[PDB]
């Protein structure tokens, strides 16, 4: 998609805008002999709030075959807890401290 | 004569006893030690305290070794290219000064 | 003797430079234990004899 | 009997993992899990490749 400034300044109130946002973390280093880029890459639209809220895991790739890439996200522990049914039969996460 | 011989008579004798004259491979065929501090190949240490003898230093053949290698091809294909720019006027060029 | 020179010469000028070939990372559970002692996480598909 | 419920097997949940891949990243090495460990762990590994 391609959002003109005019469209963000004239979209009707209550219409849902649909914006796209790069996660450019999975972007490989430039070739050492690739030509220099004379001009700049500029950007105008930014979120006001966190966007990646549904995100669970990020950048499932190695960095130097051990080190994690900066900004990669392992799943939260709760995704994997599978605790137990409670005395009444409610679901529960496993105990943290033993007691 | 049999100087190239490594193993001889790979068959049983009474399902345990070795045939007389059968030859197991020498231990060095299987050492795969390590690279030295400078990167030479070496057999593993014999006694715990002594350092390992370099494989080139002794006459034994050894069939496992640590070879360094690139993980993928060196020739990525991004060959270097340049912006040659000529002198503006040939008369003005400074041949002088070394 | 002529032949020895060619070994020497041919070895004097070996310019081969190894790149990793196809590899394999068996799970430890699929390897009989001695092989697991000998293997080091992964190996070239073309292990030769030893 | 009244059809008060809806018998089903291998239930589908309310939330599911969606995943976007960058398809130029693949490990040169190839894992070789046992067939049963692949029957178990497999849909996961295929999803989080």
């Amino acid at each position: 998609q391609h959002v003109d400034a005019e469209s963000i300044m004239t979209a009707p109130k209550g219409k849902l805008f649909h914006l796209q946002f790069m996660d450019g973390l999975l972007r490989p280093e430039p070739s050492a002999f690739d030509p220099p880029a004379s001009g700049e890459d500029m950007r105008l639209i930014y979120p006001l709030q966190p966007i990646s809220v549904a995100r669970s895991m990020r950048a499932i790739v190695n960095h130097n075959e051990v080190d994690r890439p900066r900004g990669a996200v392992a799943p939260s522990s709760y995704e994997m807890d599978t605790g137990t049914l409670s005395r009444n039969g409610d679901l529960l996460y496993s105990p943290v401290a033993n007691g | 004569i049999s100087v190239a011989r490594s193993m001889r008579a790979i068959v049983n004798h009474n399902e345990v006893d070795r045939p007389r004259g059968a030859v197991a491979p020498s231990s060095y065929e299987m050492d795969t030690g390590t690279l030295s501090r400078n990167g030479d190949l070496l057999y593993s240490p014999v006694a715990n305290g002594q350092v390992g003898i370099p494989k080139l230093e002794v006459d034994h053949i050894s069939f496992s070794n640590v070879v360094s290698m690139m993980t993928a091809n060196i020739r990525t294909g991004d060959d270097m290219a340049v912006e040659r720019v000529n002198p503006d006027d040939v008369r003005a060029i400074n041949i002088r000064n070394a | 003797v002529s032949g020895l020179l060619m070994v020497l010469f041919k070895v004097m000028t070996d310019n081969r430079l190894v790149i990793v070939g196809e590899t394999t990372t068996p799970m430890s559970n699929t390897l009989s234990t001695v092989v697991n002692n000998v293997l080091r996480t992964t190996y070239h598909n073309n292990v030769g004899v030893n | 009997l009244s059809d008060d419920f809806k018998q089903i097997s291998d239930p589908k949940g309310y939330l599911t993992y969606s995943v976007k891949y960058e398809d130029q990243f693949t490990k040169k090495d190839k894992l070789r899990a046992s067939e049963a460990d692949d029957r178990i762990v497999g849909p996961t590994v295929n999803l989080f490749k």
């Binding site: 973390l25 999975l26 972007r27 490989p28 280093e29 950048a59 790739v61 190695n62 960095h63 130097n64 075959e65 890439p69 | 993980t71 993928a72 091809n73 020739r75 294909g77 | 081969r16 790149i19 070939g21 073309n46 030769g48 004899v49 | 130029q24 990243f25 693949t26 490990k27 040169k28």
Partner: peptide, 26 residues
């Protein structure tokens, strides 16, 4: 049924290095 000798020697499998376009890390 007559006995027979035979022989073998380990083959070369030295391919020239492959050109993968895929990359393995960031």
């Amino acid at each position: 049924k007559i006995a027979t000798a035979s022989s073998a020697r380990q083959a070369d499998v030295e391919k020239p290095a492959d050109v993968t376009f895929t990359i393995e890390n960031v």
